[PDB]
C-alpha cells in the first residue's frame, strides 16, 4: 500500500482570476459599411457558431458585482471613446460673445425659448480676416454672460471638441472572448440569483454580442429575462445600492425628432471643417417618444408581484419621479440616430399599488455638447444631423433606487436613479466569469517508476 | 504487411501566404551621421553573406499585380514618412495675407514671372509684438487672393515643415524573411509578370531596394538582364499601366544652377523656420541633360520589343503628356533634397515605322508638396543653399496605351500611371513570400515496436 | 578506452552581456498614493525574500564606468520624466511681456530685488476678452527684453507646467535581471571601482536605489561600510570625475522659512495654471545648515584616504567653483517638490597639511532645464507653506585642477555635473552576465547500441 504520487496534466481545474478580454466580432460584419466607433477600424473576426457546452453534474458560484469584466470593459469603452475623438478637431474658438435673438418663426407655443439664433465674431481660415457667422442653438447648451450677452455653457469647464461626423455612434454587438488557457463560465439557471451557486453550468470559449448601449434610466436593447421579470441588487436592505430590474417581455418605444434640420459647413482654419444647424423647415415641434399604456401597467404590475417577495406582500408599493439633481440622472437619455435625447419619464412613475388611450407620450430635450460618462475633464459637440430623426427600440429593464426611512415594513417607494453605466454593463454581463485552467496535477497511484 | 503512415518533420513546404516584412539595413553604415527618413537613423543590420540557393528541377508560379509585399511596403513608406514628419513643427500661421511683387533684374529672359517677392504682417515670437519679414516664392506655390497672394493650401489641409537636417537621400533596404518563412526568386533572365518560371532560386533575405520616388521614369532600378522587358496586367486593357524596364542604363544630369541662400525665421518661442533668401548671381531655369543618341537607340529597342505583341507593320507613336494633375503631367524626382518637375514631352516627340549629342529639358520647382494622393497632409520644401547637381540612371518607363487604334494599326503611348505601387512592383517583381510547413506524413514499413 | 565528449545541461555559465533590467518596487508601496513620477501607475512588486548567497571560491572581474546599466538608468529616467511631463499643459502663452516692479514685504536687506511683482494682460477663458493678473516671480527666472521683463526661457524650447499631483520624492527601485541572466555583486567592503573582487555574491534583484538628483555632493546614498573611499577609473586624468563616498553620514537641513501662497488662473478651457500668490510676513532666504565639527572630521578623513594615492606631505587645498552653467556652479537638489541652489563656497575654504553649525545661503529657480537637455523646459509649481528638509550627505563628486609640478600642492573643486556618476556611485557593485545552461566534457560512456 506504499503508494507513490503521479503527475497528471490537462486535468480540469478552475482558479478565480482576472485577465484582459479578447475583442471579437462575427466575421467582422461591420466591414460592410464605414465607419463605426464601437467596432473601430478593426477587430478579430470570430466563428459564427461558438460551441456552447453543457457542464452536467456541475454547480459553481457567480458572485455578481464582484466580477471584473465590467470594470475592464468600462475602461475599454472609455479608451475607445477617447481614441475615436482624438483625431478630430478642437472647438475652443466658438464661445466668443454671442448676440442672440428670440425664435418665434413657425414655432409651437409650448416650446418658446428652447432655441436661440446667435451671432458672433469668429475668424475665417485666413489668419487676418474675420467673418460674421450665425447659427441656431438649443437653450440648454448656452448661458447668459451677464444678468443679453450669451456664451457656451461649458467654456469655464474643460476643453471642447467636435465629434467629426464621418463615424457613426450606433452600437454594434461586441463579443468577449477568452484568452488561451481560459474559459468563460456561464450559468444555465433560469431564475438565477445574482449571488449564489448555479445548479447547471455551461462554458464557452467566446461570448455572444452585447451592444454598448448608453442609457440613464431605462435598459435598452438588452437581453430579455428568460422566464419572468426579475430584480437584483447587492443587498436589498442597503438602499444605497442600485435596484436592477430585467423585463421578461420587451416594451417597444417610438422616438422621433420631428423637424427638418438643415446643416451648413463653416471653415474655421485650414483643414478645419465645422458644422452648425441652419434654418429649420416647417413648424418647429418638440421631440417626443411613444409607449403603450396597458402594457406599462402590465410590466409595472409584474414588477410589483416580484417585489412583494422581498417584503411583506401586503405592503404598499409606489413610484414617483426622480428626486432631482444633475439631469444625467434626473432625466432619461439615449443616442438613437447618433443624436442625444433627454426625455421626461416623470409620467411613467405616476402610479400606486396596493394588495390584492393605448399610448403614452413623453416630452424630450435636446443638447449638443455632452459631458460624456461621469468625466468632467472633456466636453464634446455632436454634429447636427439633417432631416427627421427616428428611433425604434426595445425596453428591456429598469434601474431603481429605494427611499430610506421606511418603518413598520409598509409603504415601500422607488425612484429612478443610479445612472452609472456600470450597472447596465453588469445587467448584460451577469452570466459570465473568467476562470483559469491549471492543467498540471498530481495524485497517488499504485504505479512505481521503472528502475533506472 | 499493409503500409502505415509515418510522421515527417522539417520537410520543405511551399504555401502561398503573407506576413509582415522584417526591416533590414546594410550593416547600419549610415548610423555615423544624422539624419535619414528612409533609414530612421537605424534598422536591424544584416550580414554581407546571405547565400542564394538554386532550386534545380524546380519551377514555380509568379503573379504580379497580385503579390502583396508591394502594398505592404507602400503602407510601410506612408507610415515612415508620417513618423518622420510628426516631430517637426507646423507652419500654420504662414498663410496670413501677403503683399507681393514680381522679381526684377539679374534674370534670364525665360524666367519672367517664375519668382515672386512677398512680405508679411506676421508676428514675433512674442505674442504682443509684430514684425515684417520677406522671402522669395515660386509662382507655382502661391495664388492670388482675388497685387496680393496667399499660400495655395490654406483651403485644404494645413502645411507643416521642420527638421531640415534630416536627409531625404534613399538607402538600401532589405525586406528580410521572418523565421519559418522564405523568399524565392525566378532565375529566368526574361520573365512575364505572371506564370511559372522554369528556373528558380531562394534567398534568406532580400537585395537592396531603393525607396526612391519618381513619377514618369524609373530611376536607380535594376537593369534588365538581357533585353528591355515590357510588363503589364493585361496588354489589351488600356486601364493597366505598361511597365518598361531598361537592360542598359541611360544617364541623366540635372541641376539647379542658382546659388541659393537661407534665412532663419523665428515665429514662435523656439520654433525655427527657414525662408529662401535672395539668390546670388543671375537666375537660370533648372534643367536636365540626357544623351540624344542613347535615348534614340533605347526607344528603338523599346519599339522593337513593342512589336512582339502587335502586328509587325504597326506604327509606334509616342505623344506629349495628357495633362491633369502636375504630378502626372511632368516627371518628378527629389534628389539632392529638393523636388523637381520637368517637361518630358520633348523625350516623347517621335514616331516609329517598320524596317548636339545631348537633350535638355526645362524643369520646374515646387516647394509645397502633397505626397502620394493624400489630401489631409501637406509640407514645405526647406530651401537648400547653393547649386545642386544630380546624376542618375534612367532604368525604365511607366507608360499607358491610348484607346481606339482601330483596325490594328498606329498604336500610340503617353506617360502616366502616377501610382508608385507600380514602381515598387517594377523592382520587387522578383520575389514572393511563401510558408514553410515542416511537419508532414507519409506511408512506411514502420509498425510501432511493442512496448 | 578512449574518452568521448558528453553534453551537459544546467551548468552555470556567465558571459559579460547586457539586457534591459526588470522594474521592481517594494510590495508596490507607492500604489497607496496617486502617484510617484518614477513609480507611476504600476510596477512589479519585489520578491518578499530577495535572497542572495555568497559565492565560495569565486573572484570576478568588475569594471565600474564600463557597466551599461547606468546608461539604461539615465535613459529610463529621462523616459519616465518625459512620460509624466507629456499629459500636461503647455505655457507658450506666458511669453507675453510683463510689467514688473521691485516689490518688498518686510524683506531682508540681502534679498532686495530677488523677487519681482509682474503683471500682464494675459488670457481669459473667452478668446475675445482679456484681463490683468499679477504674480510674484524670482528675478533669476526673468530677463529684461532691452522695467518690463520677459521670462528667460522664451528664446528656447517651449515651457510646460501642469500635473502637480505627481510626486517628486524619490522611491527606492529594485532591478532584477531577465530570466536567463543573473546579478553579481562584490562582497569586498574595500573594493576598487575596477579589478578582481575577492569575495562575491549573487542576488535575484539589486537593492533599492533612490533616483536622487544632485550636482555637487551626493544625497540619500548608501554609506561606505568601513572607511571613506575615493574612486576614479584613472586618477592621472584630471578631466575625469573623482568619486567620494562617505562611511558616516553628514546631516544637513534646508528650509524656505516663509509660507508660500498660491493662486490659479485659466489660460483657457482645461488649462489650469498655478501661480505664486502674494507672500505674507518677513521675507527671508532659503538656506541650509551643517555642523562644523563633523564637516572637519569627515573632510579630514577624506584627506587621510586621499593621501594614499599621492606622495606624503603633499599639500591639499579646496577652493570655490571656477564658474560655468549654474547647475554645476552651485549645488542643486529637489526637496519638498521644489528645486534649490546653494553657494557651497563656504565649506571648501580650507587647506590641509602634514601632521557649531555652518549656514549656507540658497537660491530658488522655477524655470528648470532637465539634465543637459535644451529641447524641453518646465515651470515648477509653487509649494505651499514652509518647506523643511532633513537629509544626509553620503558623498561628493570632485575634480582635480591640472598642471602644477613636482606632484605637490594638489587642489580640488566640485565638478562632474553629469549625474551618470551619481547613479554609478550606487550601481558600481553590480554586473549582469548571460547564462547558457549547456556544457560539454569528455566521459567514459557510449550511447547504448540499439
Amino acid at each position, epitope marked *: 500500500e506504499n503508494l507513490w504520487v503521479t503527475v497528471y496534466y490537462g486535468v480540469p481545474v478552475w482558479k478565480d482570476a482576472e485577465t484582459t478580454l479578447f475583442c471579437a466580432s462575427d466575421a467582422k460584419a461591420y466591414e460592410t459599411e464605414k465607419h463605426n466607433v464601437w467596432a473601430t477600424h478593426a477587430c478579430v473576426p470570430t466563428d459564427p457558431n461558438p460551441q456552447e457546452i453543457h457542464l452536467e453534474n456541475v454547480t459553481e458560484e457567480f458572485n455578481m458585482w464582484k466580477n471584473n469584466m465590467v470594470e475592464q470593459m468600462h475602461t475599454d469603452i472609455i479608451s475607445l471613446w477617447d481614441q475615436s475623438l482624438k483625431p478630430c478637431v478642437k472647438l475652443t474658438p466658438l464661445c466668443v460673445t454671442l448676440q442672440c435673438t428670440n425664435v418665434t418663426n413657425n414655432i409651437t407655443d409650448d416650446m418658446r425659448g428652447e432655441l436661440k439664433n446667435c451671432s458672433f465674431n469668429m475668424t475665417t481660415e485666413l489668419r*487676418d480676416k474675420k467673418q460674421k457667422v450665425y447659427s441656431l442653438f438649443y437653450r440648454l447648451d448656452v448661458v447668459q454672460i451677464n444678468e443679453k450677452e450669451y456664451r457656451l455653457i461649458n467654456c469655464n469647464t474643460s476643453a471642447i471638441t467636435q465629434a467629426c461626423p464621418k463615424v457613426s455612434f450606433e452600437p454594434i454587438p461586441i463579443h468577449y472572448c477568452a484568452p488561451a488557457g481560459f474559459a468563460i463560465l456561464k450559468c444555465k439557471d433560469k431564475k438565477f440569483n445574482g449571488t449564489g451557486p448555479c445548479p447547471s453550468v455551461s462554458t464557452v470559449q467566446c461570448t455572444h454580442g452585447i451592444k454598448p448601449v448608453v442609457s440613464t434610466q431605462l435598459l435598452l436593447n438588452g437581453s430579455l429575462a428568460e422566464e419572468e421579470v426579475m430584480i437584483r441588487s447587492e443587498n436589498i436592505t442597503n438602499n444605497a445600492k442600485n435596484i436592477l430590474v430585467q423585463f421578461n417581455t420587451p416594451v417597444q418605444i417610438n422616438c422621433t425628432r420631428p423637424n427638418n434640420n438643415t446643416r451648413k459647413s463653416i471653415r474655421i482654419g485650414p483643414g478645419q471643417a465645422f458644422y452648425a444647424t441652419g434654418d429649420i423647415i416647417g413648424d418647429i415641434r418638440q421631440a417626443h417618444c411613444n409607449v403603450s399604456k396597458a402594457t406599462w401597467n402590465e410590466t409595472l404590475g409584474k414588477v410589483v408581484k416580484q417585489l412583494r417577495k422581498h417584503f411583506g406582500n401586503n405592503t404598499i408599493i409606489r413610484f414617483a419621479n426622480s428626486s432631482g439633481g444633475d439631469l444625467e440622472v434626473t432625466t432619461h437619455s439615449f443616442n438613437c440616430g447618433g443624436e442625444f435625447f433627454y426625455c421626461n419619464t416623470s409620467g411613467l412613475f405616476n402610479s400606486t399599488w396596493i394588495s390584492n388611450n393605448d399610448s403614452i407620450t413623453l416630452p424630450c430635450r435636446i443638447k449638443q455638447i455632452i459631458n460624456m460618462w461621469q468625466r468632467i475633464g472633456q466636453a464634446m459637440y455632436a454634429p447636427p444631423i439633417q432631416g427627421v430623426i427616428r428611433c425604434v427600440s426595445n425596453i428591456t429593464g429598469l434601474i431603481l433606487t429605494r427611499d430610506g426611512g421606511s418603518t413598520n415594513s409598509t409603504t415601500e417607494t422607488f425612484r429612478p436613479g443610479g445612472g452609472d453605466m456600470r450597472d447596465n454593463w453588469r445587467s448584460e454581463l451577469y452570466k459570465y466569469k473568467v476562470v483559469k485552467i491549471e492543467p498540471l496535477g498530481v495524485a497517488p497511484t499504485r504505479c512505481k517508476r521503472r528502475v533506472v | 504487411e499493409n503500409l502505415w503512415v509515418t510522421v515527417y518533420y522539417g520537410v520543405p513546404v511551399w504555401k502561398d501566404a503573407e506576413t509582415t516584412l522584417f526591416c533590414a539595413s546594410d550593416a547600419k553604415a549610415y548610423e555615423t551621421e544624422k539624419h535619414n527618413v528612409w533609414a530612421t537613423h537605424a534598422c536591424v543590420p544584416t550580414d554581407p553573406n546571405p547565400q542564394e540557393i538554386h532550386l534545380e528541377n524546380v519551377t514555380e508560379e509568379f503573379n504580379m499585380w497580385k503579390n502583396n509585399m508591394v502594398e505592404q511596403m507602400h503602407t510601410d513608406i506612408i507610415s515612415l514618412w508620417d513618423q518622420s514628419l510628426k516631430p517637426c513643427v507646423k507652419l500654420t500661421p504662414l498663410c496670413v495675407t501677403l503683399q507681393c511683387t514680381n522679381v526684377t533684374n539679374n534674370i534670364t529672359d525665360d524666367m519672367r514671372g517664375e519668382l515672386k517677392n512677398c512680405s508679411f504682417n*506676421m508676428t514675433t515670437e512674442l*505674442r504682443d509684438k509684430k514684425q515684417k519679414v520677406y522671402s522669395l516664392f515660386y509662382r507655382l506655390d502661391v495664388v492670388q487672393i482675388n497685387k496680393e497672394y496667399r499660400l495655395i493650401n490654406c483651403n485644404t489641409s494645413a502645411i507643416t515643415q521642420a527638421c531640415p537636417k534630416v536627409s531625404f537621400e534613399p538607402i538600401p533596404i532589405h525586406y528580410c524573411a521572418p523565421a519559418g518563412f522564405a523568399i524565392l526568386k525566378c532565375k529566368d533572365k526574361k520573365f512575364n509578370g505572371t506564370g511559372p518560371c522554369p528556373s528558380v532560386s531562394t534567398v534568406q533575405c532580400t537585395h537592396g531596394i531603393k525607396p526612391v520616388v519618381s513619377t514618369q521614369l524609373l530611376l536607380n532600378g535594376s537593369l534588365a538582364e538581357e533585353e528591355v522587358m515590357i510588363r503589364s496586367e493585361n496588354i489589351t486593357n488600356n486601364a493597366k499601366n505598361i511597365l518598361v524596364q531598361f537592360n542598359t542604363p541611360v544617364q541623366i544630369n540635372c541641376t539647379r544652377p542658382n546659388n541659393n541662400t537661407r534665412k532663419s525665421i523665428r515665429i514662435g518661442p523656439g520654433q525655427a523656420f527657414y525662408a529662401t533668401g535672395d539668390i546670388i548671381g543671375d537666375i537660370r531655369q533648372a534643367h536636365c541633360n540626357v544623351s540624344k543618341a542613347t535615348w534614340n537607340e533605347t526607344l528603338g529597342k523599346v519599339v522593337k520589343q513593342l512589336r512582339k505583341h502587335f502586328g509587325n507593320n504597326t506604327i509606334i507613336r509616342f505623344a506629349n503628356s495628357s495633362g491633369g494633375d502636375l504630378e502626372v503631367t511632368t516627371h518628378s524626382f527629389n534628389c539632392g533634397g529638393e523636388f523637381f518637375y520637368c517637361n518630358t514631352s520633348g523625350l516623347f516627340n517621335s514616331t516609329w515605322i517598320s524596317n548636339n549629342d545631348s537633350i535638355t529639358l526645362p524643369c520646374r520647382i515646387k516647394q509645397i508638396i502633397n505626397m502620394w494622393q493624400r489630401i489631409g497632409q501637406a509640407m514645405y520644401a526647406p530651401p537648400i543653399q547653393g547649386v545642386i547637381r544630380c546624376v542618375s540612371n534612367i532604368t525604365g518607363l511607366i507608360l499607358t496605351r491610348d484607346g481606339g487604334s482601330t483596325n490594328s494599326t498606329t498604336e500610340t503611348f503617353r506617360p502616366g500611371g502616377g501610382d508608385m505601387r507600380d514602381n515598387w512592383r517594377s523592382e520587387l517583381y522578383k520575389y514572393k513570400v511563401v510558408k514553410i510547413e515542416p511537419l508532414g506524413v507519409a506511408p512506411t514499413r514502420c509498425k510501432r515496436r511493442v512496448v | 578506452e578512449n574518452l568521448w565528449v558528453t553534453v551537459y545541461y544546467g551548468v552555470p555559465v556567465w558571459k559579460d552581456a547586457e539586457t534591459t533590467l526588470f522594474c521592481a518596487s517594494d510590495a508596490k508601496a507607492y500604489e497607496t498614493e496617486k502617484h510617484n513620477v518614477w513609480a507611476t501607475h504600476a510596477c512589479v512588486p519585489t520578491d518578499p525574500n530577495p535572497q542572495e548567497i555568497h559565492l565560495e571560491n569565486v573572484t570576478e572581474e568588475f569594471n565600474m564606468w564600463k557597466n551599461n546599466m547606468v546608461e539604461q538608468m539615465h535613459t529610463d529616467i529621462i523616459s519616465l520624466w518625459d512620460q509624466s511631463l507629456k499629459p500636461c499643459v503647455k505655457l*507658450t502663452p506666458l511669453c507675453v511681456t510683463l510689467q514688473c516692479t521691485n516689490v518688498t514685504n518686510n524683506i531682508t536687506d540681502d534679498m532686495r530685488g530677488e523677487l519681482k511683482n509682474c503683471s500682464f494682460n494675459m*488670457t481669459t477663458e473667452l478668446r475675445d476678452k482679456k484681463q490683468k493678473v499679477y504674480s510674484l516671480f524670482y528675478r533669476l527666472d526673468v530677463v529684461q527684453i532691452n522695467k518690463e521683463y520677459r521670462l528667460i526661457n522664451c528664446n528656447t524650447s517651449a515651457i510646460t507646467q501642469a500635473c502637480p499631483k505627481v510626486s517628486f520624492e524619490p522611491i527606492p527601485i529594485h532591478y532584477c535581471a531577465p530570466a536567463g541572466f543573473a546579478i553579481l555583486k562584490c562582497k569586498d567592503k574595500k573594493f576598487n571601482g575596477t579589478g578582481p573582487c575577492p569575495s562575491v555574491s549573487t542576488v535575484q534583484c539589486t537593492h533599492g536605489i533612490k533616483p536622487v538628483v544632485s550636482t555637487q555632493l551626493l544625497l540619500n546614498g548608501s554609506l561606505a561600510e568601513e572607511e571613506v573611499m575615493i574612486r576614479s577609473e584613472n586618477i592621472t586624468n584630471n578631466a575625469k570625475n573623482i568619486l567620494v563616498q562617505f562611511n558616516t553620514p553628514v546631516q544637513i537641513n534646508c528650509t524656505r522659512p516663509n509660507n508660500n501662497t498660491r493662486k490659479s488662473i485659466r489660460i483657457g478651457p482645461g488649462q489650469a495654471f498655478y501661480a505664486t500668490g502674494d507672500i505674507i510676513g518677513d521675507i527671508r532666504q532659503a538656506h541650509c545648515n551643517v555642523s562644523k565639527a563633523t564637516w572637519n572630521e569627515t573632510l579630514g578623513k577624506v584627506v587621510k584616504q586621499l593621501r594614499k594615492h599621492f606622495g606624503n606631505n603633499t599639500i591639499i587645498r579646496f577652493a570655490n567653483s571656477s564658474g560655468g552653467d549654474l547647475e554645476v556652479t552651485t549645488h542643486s537638489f529637489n526637496c519638498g517638490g521644489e528645486f534649490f541652489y546653494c553657494n557651497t563656497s563656504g565649506l571648501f575654504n580650507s587647506t590641509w597639511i602634514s601632521n557649531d553649525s555652518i549656514t549656507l545661503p540658497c537660491r530658488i529657480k522655477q524655470i528648470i532645464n532637465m539634465w543637459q537637455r535644451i529641447g524641453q523646459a518646465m515651470y515648477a509649481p509653487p509649494i505651499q507653506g514652509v518647506i523643511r528638509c532633513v537629509s544626509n550627505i553620503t558623498g561628493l563628486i570632485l575634480t582635480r585642477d591640472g598642471g602644477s609640478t613636482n606632484s605637490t600642492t594638489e587642489t580640488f573643486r566640485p565638478g562632474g555635473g553629469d549625474m551618470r556618476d551619481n547613479w554609478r556611485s550606487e550601481l558600481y557593485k553590480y554586473k549582469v552576465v548571460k547564462i547558457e545552461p549547456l556544457g560539454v566534457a569528455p566521459t567514459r560512456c557510449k550511447r547504448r547500441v540499439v
Partner: nanobody
Amino acid sequence: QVQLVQSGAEVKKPGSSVKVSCKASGNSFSNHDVHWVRQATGQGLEWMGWMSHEGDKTGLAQKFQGRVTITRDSGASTVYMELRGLTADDTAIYYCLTGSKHRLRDYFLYNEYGPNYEEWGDYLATLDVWGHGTAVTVSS
C-alpha cells in the same frame, strides 16, 4: 447738457509758462473724450490735444510737442493743461470741449493657443458741446 467750467482770462509774461483748469458736471470725462483747441481772432481753429475718455491715451499737435502736458485729477472729475514757452504771438482764445471717438481693431491675428494679437486705434467721431473757453494773452 453737461455743464463745462474753464479757467478765467489771464495775462502772462513773455517766455513763461501758463496753465488752465477744466471741469464738467457729472464726471462725464469717463464717457467723453477730453479735447483742447486754440484760435485767434480772424483765424481758423487749431487743435491742441486730446485725452481718451478712458484716460489711457494722450496726444498733441506736432506744433506743440515739448510744450504742452495734460493732467487730470483722481476720478477724472477735472482735467488740466499746461503750456510752456508762450510769447506775444501765443495770444488767443483757448477752449475746452468733450468728444466721442470710434475704437476699432486696426490689425489682428487669431492665436489658437494664445490671445489674438490686436492693433487697436481711436477714430474721433465728432466734437461734442464746447466749453465757454479761456482767454490767455502775453504782454510785458
